[PDB]
From Swiss-Prot, chain A:
Temperature behavior of the protein's activity: Optimum temperature is 50 degrees Celsius.
Source organism (scientific name): Delftia sp. (strain HT23)
Cofactor binding description: Divalent metal ions, such as manganese, cobalt and nickel.
Molecular function terms from GO: ammonia-lyase activity; D-serine ammonia-lyase activity; pyridoxal phosphate binding
Gene: dthadh
Pfam families: Ala_racemase_N (PF01168), D-ser_dehydrat (PF14031)
EC nos: 4.3.1.27
Name listed for the protein in its UniProt record: D-threo-3-hydroxyaspartate dehydratase
Assembly with partners or alone: Monomer.
Sequence similarity: Belongs to the DSD1 family.
Modified residues (N6-(pyridoxal phosphate)lysine): 41
Catalytic activity annotation: (3R)-3-hydroxy-D-aspartate = oxaloacetate + NH4(+)
Reported regulation of activity: Strongly inhibited by hydroxylamine. Modestly inhibited by EDTA.
Length: 378, 379
């Protein structure tokens, strides 16, 4: 099985590229004196996380309890569920912990901390809960210098007989930046807010062994991480065009592409039609907001060579329109990409495109492939 | 019995009553037009959903992948139109489906694809049935309706080659760019007129063309006459969505698909409620952002699924939805107006994109009880 024999579209991981990505991130975190806790929401795949663990990762972060089940059943026990804890999901969290999953939960309100602690007391479980900090006004979390809410939550947890294990933050606004200076200042803001919260917890005599920060861009841009114990990053494993435009990788580093077959043309308009539509690429159009818009993806040849100036300018559910970015009509598009030619499309957003497929085709050095299943749903 | 209260979130909820209204209405329209209805299962990829389309009077189905064709044929459907231009490397799979008794139709829009099909047909003693895709509106594949030389060259390649030239089809997909009953009617007429024009030119040259197949949900509902057409193809109608609502072929109250979600927190001063349906649940689809009304990541309804007006998902991260006022003002006591643990239902931008985020649907009955309806994922 190789790139010529796969049915298309198919999500291809280039292993050499994935390995270089995994190594770059780990050596960076080593140099920073910090643990790396990869976010598996990018791949939801056991063998991709195994590769991250083999290079030195510690534990994982997950976006759903379903991911936690999957990775636990496959042997990972150090699992951070980094999404504000819904009380109704407490039974399921407890069941994971009682089965031996060292599952960590997060909260950002008093009421949520109250429900966890009461359930904990009622069930005889000291849940380990971390407090989410908001450092860039981007999602959930406790304002970095809203100490009263911080300590009120700290107290609810610690007085309540739960384990207050740390603070975390995720500076998601990284995604909107596109310079080294601004990413650097954003990473520093992420570090300082998170550490400031830790120290305020410790000043009030509450424990706070874990200080957890990160997004892929802040992970790669931070000049210093004093006071941080771990960084969480996920999308870096494959990279994607949004990250390329952010400035933290080149298009060549993108390890995930979508293998597509040319099924037709509109010669007239210089279009080649591929069987990779938005069902394959997903509807994500993150690069439309950035300084270089790649439509529904950057075209590469079968070998993985980027072909600048050809992108998917359009997409329907099961067809994509391959055409010139400069909007001119390619002359003789049919003779350039005859019926049946296979190409590889780089995604806007690796997390979104990977979710369209039941599996990855992992491409090894000899041109051979291995199917790596991934998780779908909740 | 699982209810909207016991289910986990996010969950794709089909209101069965609403779905049934949608199925009744579309079939009726086509009966009134004297045309067959060949439902496109790509919206749903779900056997029971197509059971109820066929129950209502449908004939055969349209699939968007040969995996859909595998799945429906296994479940007993034998009359299947694979309506994406045929890739030659897929020919063994198409052959094998036909050999097991699937009456599978293929489509092409070029001479080269017709030659490939016909050579493999010859080598394998299989007279494939092939239809010619017609471009009537410029947004995708197809032979131009007035491109008689290429039509005749494709038709003769199929026919001289021993294959069965079964018909022409077109799909006018620019119906989403429109929003008035007059523009929809003109576009449906243009779709009808081009497809029939193409069928008449094959016939005038002596080639068979007994099927003339048109359709998009909006055009199937808006067409006043369908002379010359033998079948209509419509899919998203089964559930509707906000793009459809915005286009004008249904109200928000006919949308049968919703995403059940739970409030997991707030940003007080910004007037935010946080829900566990981010773009992973909704999909990244934002079809409503270029239309008369923007619903960001979806219209917020309550548990019983009535529209709460002016509350939408204004942003979405992967597993986090941002529930705010569409008008961009910051709601006072958002936290009292949507308390932690409250479950809501979100109407989707695009039902085809939303349902594909789920392994299954939760098909909600009269009595408040749901049932898991699996749907297909992948290729
Ligand atoms: C996604 C995510 C990360 C990793 O972010 P990327 O930029 O996707 O690598 C870390 N922490 C949390 C809470 C996340 O949701
Ligand atoms: C999607 C599709 C339809 C049905 O269109 P909706 O407007 O989505 O119901 C019909 N024909 C073809 C070829 C399609 O791809």
């Amino acid at each position: 099985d190789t790139l010529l024999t796969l049915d298309t579209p198919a999500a291809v991981i280039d292993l050499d590229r994935m390995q270089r990505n995994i190594a770059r991130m780990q050596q960076r975190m080593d140099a920073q004196g910090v643990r790396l806790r990869p976010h598996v929401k990018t791949s939801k795949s056991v063998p991709v996380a195994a590769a991250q663990r083999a290079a030195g990762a510690s534990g994982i972060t997950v976006s759903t309890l379903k991911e936690a089940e999957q990775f636990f059943a496959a042997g990972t026990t150090d699992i951070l569920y980094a999404v504000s804890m819904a009380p109704h999901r407490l039974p399921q969290a407890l069941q994971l912990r009682r089965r031996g999953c060292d599952l960590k939960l997060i909260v950002d309100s008093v009421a949520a901390a109250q429900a966890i602690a009461a359930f904990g007391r009622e069930q005889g479980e000291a849940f380990e809960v971390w407090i989410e900090i908001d450092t860039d006004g981007h999602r959930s979390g406790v304002g970095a210098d809203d100490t009263p809410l911080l300590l009120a939550i700290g107290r609810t947890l610690h007085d309540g007989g739960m384990r207050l294990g740390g603070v975390l933050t995720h500076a998601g606004s990284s995604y909107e930046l596109d310079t080294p200076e601004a990413l650097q200042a954003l990473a520093e803001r992420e570090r300082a807010g998170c550490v400031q919260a830790a120290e305020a917890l410790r000043a009030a005599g509450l424990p706070c062994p874990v200080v957890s920060v990160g997004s892929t861009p802040t992970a790669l841009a931070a000049s210093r991480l004093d006071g941080v114990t771990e960084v969480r990053a996920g999308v870096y494993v494959f990279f994607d065009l949004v990250m390329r435009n952010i400035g933290v990788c080149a298009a060549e580093d993108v390890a995930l592409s979508v293998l597509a077959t040319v099924i037709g043309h509109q010669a007239d308009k210089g279009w080649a039609i591929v069987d990779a539509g938005w069902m394959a690429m997903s509807r994500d159009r993150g690069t439309a907001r950035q300084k270089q818009d790649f439509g529904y993806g950057q075209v590469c040849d079968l070998q993985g060579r980027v072909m600048p100036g050809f992108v998917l300018t359009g997409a329907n559910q099961e067809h994509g329109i391959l055409a010139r970015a400069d909007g001119a009509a390619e002359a003789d598009i049919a003779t350039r990409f005859p019926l049946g030619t296979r190409l590889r499309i780089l995604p806007n957003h690796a997390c979104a495109t990977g979710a369209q497929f039941p599996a990855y085709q992992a491409l090894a050095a000899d041109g051979s492939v291995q199917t790596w299943e991934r998780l779908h749903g909740w």
